[PDB]
Amino acid sequence: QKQIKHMMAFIEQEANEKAEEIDAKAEEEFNIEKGRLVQTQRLKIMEYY
Amino acid sequence: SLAEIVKKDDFVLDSEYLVTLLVVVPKLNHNDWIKQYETLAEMVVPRSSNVLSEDQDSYLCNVTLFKKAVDDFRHKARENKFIVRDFQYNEEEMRADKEEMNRLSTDKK
Amino acid sequence: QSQGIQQLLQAEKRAAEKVSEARKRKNRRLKQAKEEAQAEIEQYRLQREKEFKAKE
């Protein structure tokens, strides 16, 4: 009967959405990470020179 | 005490999304519950009932469902006079209950 | 057991694997973000080096 296919598709769709949310949160962290690193090191390079 | 009845194999265990419940049903209401099994709440696993015990007034049976549906299931079960027994399997507690009555008898002696 | 349960367990396994693969993507791409930052800071270093050589 159809309901098992619906349930499989439902929980795999929750994983599709959870995977996409992890991918989105990953991108947002990388946009913070490079900002912290590059600006700190640029300022240290300037404080040195 | 259900440790005299149930086995680890009678349940879905450690799932992220499924739970197996125990329902106690009046013996005259057996065919009504068999008719309701497919329909009583959303996201129940079809055609997967199993009677684990039976008695003069009633019988005790499996159902398995998506973990969201448990409240609708137990509520609509109570509206149909089917009774969801609160139980969760852990073999260490089943073994502990089998040990304890013998310990109590030993300590009394 | 009725076999439907086994297919839903396979689906929850496929589901868990999809979210695990997104965590594995995050773990790899974090190192890529560090390697990108490490390129830019060398340009700022080279720029101040060339400017300092010009002043000397």
UniProtKB/Swiss-Prot annotation, chain A:
Disulfide bonds: none
Subcellular location: Apical cell membrane; Cytoplasmic vesicle, Secretory vesicle, Synaptic vesicle membrane; Cytoplasmic vesicle, Clathrin-coated vesicle membrane
Domain of life from the UniProt record: Eukaryota
Modified residues (Phosphotyrosine): Y48
Known tissue expression: Expressed in brain (at protein level).
Subunit structure as annotated in this protein's UniProt entry: V-ATPase is a heteromultimeric enzyme made up of two complexes: the ATP-hydrolytic V1 complex and the proton translocation V0 complex. The V1 complex consists of three catalytic AB heterodimers that form a heterohexamer, three peripheral stalks each consisting of EG heterodimers, one central rotor including subunits D and F, and the regulatory subunits C and H. The proton translocation complex V0 consists of the proton transport subunit a, a ring of proteolipid subunits c9c'', rotary subunit d, subunits e and f, and the accessory subunits ATP6AP1/Ac45 and ATP6AP2/PRR.
Sequence similarity: Belongs to the V-ATPase E subunit family.
Role this protein plays: Subunit of the V1 complex of vacuolar(H+)-ATPase (V-ATPase), a multisubunit enzyme composed of a peripheral complex (V1) that hydrolyzes ATP and a membrane integral complex (V0) that translocates protons. V-ATPase is responsible for acidifying and maintaining the pH of intracellular compartments and in some cell types, is targeted to the plasma membrane, where it is responsible for acidifying the extracellular environment.
Protein name: V-type proton ATPase subunit E 1
Organism (species): Rattus norvegicus
Organism lineage string: Eukaryota, Metazoa, Chordata, Craniata, Vertebrata
Entire-sequence positions represented here: 9 to 57 of 226
From Swiss-Prot, chain B:
Summary of the tissues where the protein is detected: Expressed in brain (at protein level).
Source organism, top-level taxon: Eukaryota
Subcellular location: Cytoplasmic vesicle, Secretory vesicle, Synaptic vesicle membrane; Cytoplasmic vesicle, Clathrin-coated vesicle membrane
Protein family per UniProt: Belongs to the V-ATPase C subunit family.
Function: Subunit of the V1 complex of vacuolar(H+)-ATPase (V-ATPase), a multisubunit enzyme composed of a peripheral complex (V1) that hydrolyzes ATP and a membrane integral complex (V0) that translocates protons. V-ATPase is responsible for acidifying and maintaining the pH of intracellular compartments and in some cell types, is targeted to the plasma membrane, where it is responsible for acidifying the extracellular environment. Subunit C is necessary for the assembly of the catalytic sector of the enzyme and is likely to have a specific function in its catalytic activity.
Subunit structure: V-ATPase is a heteromultimeric enzyme made up of two complexes: the ATP-hydrolytic V1 complex and the proton translocation V0 complex. The V1 complex consists of three catalytic AB heterodimers that form a heterohexamer, three peripheral stalks each consisting of EG heterodimers, one central rotor including subunits D and F, and the regulatory subunits C and H. The proton translocation complex V0 consists of the proton transport subunit a, a ring of proteolipid subunits c9c'', rotary subunit d, subunits e and f, and the accessory subunits ATP6AP1/Ac45 and ATP6AP2/PRR.
Protein name as catalogued: V-type proton ATPase subunit C 1
Part of the full-length chain shown: 165 to 273 of 382
